[model samples]
Target chain A: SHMDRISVPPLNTKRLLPTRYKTKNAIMSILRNGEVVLEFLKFRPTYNEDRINDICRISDDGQRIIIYQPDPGRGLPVREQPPDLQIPSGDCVYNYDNLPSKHWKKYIYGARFVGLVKSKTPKVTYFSTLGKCQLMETMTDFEIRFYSGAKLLKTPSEGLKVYDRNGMLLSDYSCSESRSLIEHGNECFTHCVNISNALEVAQTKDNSCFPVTIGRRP
Target chain B: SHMDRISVPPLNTKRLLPTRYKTKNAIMSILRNGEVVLEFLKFRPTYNEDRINDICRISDDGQRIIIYQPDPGRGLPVREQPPDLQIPSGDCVYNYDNLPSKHWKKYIYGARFVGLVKSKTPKVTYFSTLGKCQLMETMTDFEIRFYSGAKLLKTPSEGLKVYDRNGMLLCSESRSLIEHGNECFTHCVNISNALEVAQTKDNSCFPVTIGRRPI
Candidate 1:
């Protein structure tokens, strides 16, 4: 196995951009073991230059964990490569799929959180700025899709009620959820779940995030 | 002004594509005397070549009426012009705004109805789809704007509840208060005054008609 060893540099932990506001889109995959893996997808004006694929794995009990890596597309430029992974100054960094165990954890790190999943049904709960949680149910394909709550309100007349980390009593129709990752009509209408039924949530207190789910509703 | 007598053709009541579905956008202007003029704006895949402006007028009570006319952009082609006013083969139809009528009811016509408006305040009532009604209070400029509820539903998960003419609980929504045009939103958004407050209603029933108020 000596011939199989391939050297790769460590992840630059300092340059990791903050995840609180940048994430808006999400997808949840139900694993065979009943544990759910939720990917809190992020897009930026600078996505082509700084690509980070963020995800959160939630256990069956709703214990949440988060991790991230550069896009698996293998398209990062040479100069954009993390400094320690200097492949002779001319090549790009594409080591994610092939990197050995030693280099993998350097790029992967623990994410922060604020609360836990209180119940499997549509119940009250809370979470942190950069974390993920899931409803403990085997959801169908369409039931697992999610989008940002604040970004979907098209105008002042339209809105949705969502729980900020602070737990306020805001109604969906009265509050105008605005200024987030997407908009209505074109960019991010992935599902039709009401704002109150959001199951998987990620992002910050002010720049809040919630993912839609069918969740016990027939 | 006898030399200025310009005889125009009768209104071509045909080719008047049903106004129910095509009207999804509306703008309402409230006069100082509490009369509300609601313009049901029409747009089509062919609007780039043809444009028609349709409207409705309502009194302070719950009686409804309907009206319409071509847009005054003066750009309609000669062939698209109404057939009766075939002005020597080269002219356009511009008589609507300039017509001299001893009685405007000649331009007035009957409108259909499904429901009625009961009160200017937070009360209950009914009418056919063709009657005129108002909320109790005056309204701001943006408050008078209305949009098609059916076209706005981006997905099946969203829904609206409106009563039909018979008071059945059909979830899609709309009963003209024409006979009955007022459809409530959420848990019933009530109006505090006669000209303000519109219940959030979704859906188009029959082609509702509310004409200009002078008739």
Candidate 2:
């Protein structure tokens, strides 16, 4: 039951999972504006040596990304805080292109980057929406995946069709290309649908078509 | 009117004053158990940088103190976090004796370590213990003082008496001696303040004869 509740659908599917705080799996969502923001990462603890939540932010322009650990002193009162924990504090910054996103496995224990979405929607808007969306639940397996959209079929038995966010059919290289697009910047399109689940539209109601759409590379 | 509401009284007085989020004054309180926990500070911002309340802590034995910033990533699902924010976890730790508790003004902008209390009660147990103590308000003016106990005194009273937690009459060097006791690691005494207006009964109202029982 817990697995079912926290299970994220394969990439490119439109079906939303009950994304709540049930697991430690990570989620990576791209803002509709094409900024890639990741949630569910561990941060260095406070001066008190306590661990708090850490989030990652990719600049909308795709030029810079920052990993911000929550600075409790930012707005809270002083006397109520420890004397050593002071302002304009510590968070690591990285050039977007130079980001260690490639070697996340080495850094994040059990890091699993799942759940890729285009909009900063119902998922991220629940909490603070600085630059990233906070998707809830799941463990970080240290793996990241994106899928072209597709759906299960009845007539052809196990028939399935996948598409990018723009409703274009996806080839086997679709997910890999999406990953490349993220690490190595694109020139044509600002945003792209790297993965999704399949759905049946009215026209393909009987057969099922993954109305996925992929954008031009920028 | 805002200034009127957020004023603290001079040390050695029992009164209540209003304190709100108007300034960046800091306070350090050690629990009765002799652990230094620092609080009441602010930070700059960043992406998705939500203002979570943070607290600092010191070890009971007084060997080290740590600064704990909020880490939002620990329990949330891993897939949801930014790909870049991970690993090398934990709060920052500092050697306790090596801390710069005195020159805080050099570091914190407009910052002042206003109040120091030994107990976790009365001051931190209530509203805005993070902002200011109902130490009943006033300006820091960078002055520190200690007192025994008293209430509603008339005339230009300069005869300030001081005492230890045991209600024993204290000399001029009483507060300094107590500080030494804390640093020198004494098992018999700890950082404790007996008289507070917010408390009641044998806690607040007592004989002037220093009914102080040194626990």
lDDT of candidate 2 over A173-196, digit per residue (tens): 224443332221110110111121
lDDT of 1 at B2: 19
Docking class of 1: incorrect
lDDT per residue, candidate 2, B1-215, as tens digits?
11111111112212222222222323344344444434433433443332323334544443454544445322111122112222323435654334333212111211122232211113211111111111112211011122233111101111122344455655437544433222211111111123334456536432112122332
| Global lDDT of each candidate | 0.27, 0.28
lDDT of 1 at A100: 35
Residue B110 local lDDT, model 2 = 16
TM-score of 2: 0.18
Candidate 2: list runs displaced more than 4 Å.
A1-218, B1-33, B41-50, B60-62, B72-91, B100-115, B118-215
Worst 10-residue lDDT window for candidate 1 chain B reads B136-145
Q: What is the interface RMSD of candidate 2, in Å?
A: 34.7
Per-residue CA lDDT of model 1 for A1-218, tens digit only, reads 11123222222212121222222343334444533344434445455443334444433333322233344544233231122222322222233445434322222221111111211222221131222223221111111112332212221122222343344433322323321221222112222333334533544556633333333422
- Go through the candidates in order and give each one's DockQ: 0.01, 0.01
